[PDB]
């Protein structure tokens, strides 16, 4: 694959350019929030982000080398994780708040009306506070997000050599992460510590996603808010 021939800087530049735009929500400041309306905003936003995620995924090195079935599986597994880490990333400079959208900056109190939102909110805030404490860089962020895409569903015949291909690309992103930290001037020991620190956060992002699915499907089973058929199919993938 051509992806394996990419240098560290080529890997970084490719991921940076593949970055999806920051979308706006359909927030209406003329009316107060309800559980339905707030869920309406979040799910509408997520749906529009999904379209951009799919294109971003195609531009992640090694992803298009996979079969369509494998690409589907990886996105079905990681889509909420990817949405969350992006949310956490752009909320970094907003202590105590989550920037879902430039016109949707919320604190933990504003979504108390939504089922299970406060629980996930606190976990998201904690993740955001961690990235800020670690002074997470943009180049590190795009590496972590690509890792989530390739890793989250990798452990779920002939194409076992494509599982090999995924791991080789994951190894490339690992080299890239180290290369970034070395370029940042971190000592050799600080590099393998920070690498461990960043990757351990993925365990918590996975945790938040699974808890998120649990609440989303619950509200879906209560008809709280009409979901797009795409979003319905993403949810059913985890069920």
């Amino acid at each position: 694959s051509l992806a394996l021939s990419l240098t560290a800087d080529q890997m970084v530049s490719a991921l940076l350019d593949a970055e999806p735009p920051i979308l706006y929500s359909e927030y209406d400041p003329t009316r107060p929030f309800s559980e339905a309306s707030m869920m309406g905003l979040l799910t509408n936003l997520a749906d529009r982000e999904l379209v951009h995620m799919i294109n971003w995924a195609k531009r992640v090195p090694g992803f298009v080398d996979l079969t369509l079935h494998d690409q589907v599986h990886l996105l079905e597994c990681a889509w909420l994780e990817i949405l969350m880490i992006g949310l956490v990333w752009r909320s970094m400079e907003h202590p105590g708040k989550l920037l879902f959208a430039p016109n949707l900056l919320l604190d933990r109190n504003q979504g108390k009306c939504v089922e299970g939102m406060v629980e996930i909110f606190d976990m998201l805030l904690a993740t955001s506070s961690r990235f800020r404490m670690m002074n997470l860089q943009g180049e590190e962020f795009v590496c972590l997000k690509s890792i989530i895409l390739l890793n989250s569903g990798v452990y779920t015949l002939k194409s076992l050599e494509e599982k090999d291909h995924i791991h080789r690309v994951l190894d490339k992103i690992t080299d890239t992460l180290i290369h970034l930290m070395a370029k940042a001037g971190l000592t050799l020991q600080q590099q393998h510590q920070r690498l461990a620190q960043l990757l351990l956060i993925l365990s918590h992002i996975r945790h938040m996603s699974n808890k998120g699915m649990e609440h989303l499907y619950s509200m879906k089973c209560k008809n709280v808010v009409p979901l797009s058929d795409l979003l319905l199919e993403m949810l059913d993938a985890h069920r």
């Binding site: 799919i54 995924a57 195609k58 369509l68 589907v72 079905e76 795409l230 199919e233």
Partner: peptide
């Protein structure tokens, strides 16, 4: 097919 499986081509 899945909408996701459709969008990964278009």
């Amino acid at each position: 097919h899945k909408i996701l499986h459709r969008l990964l081509q278009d």
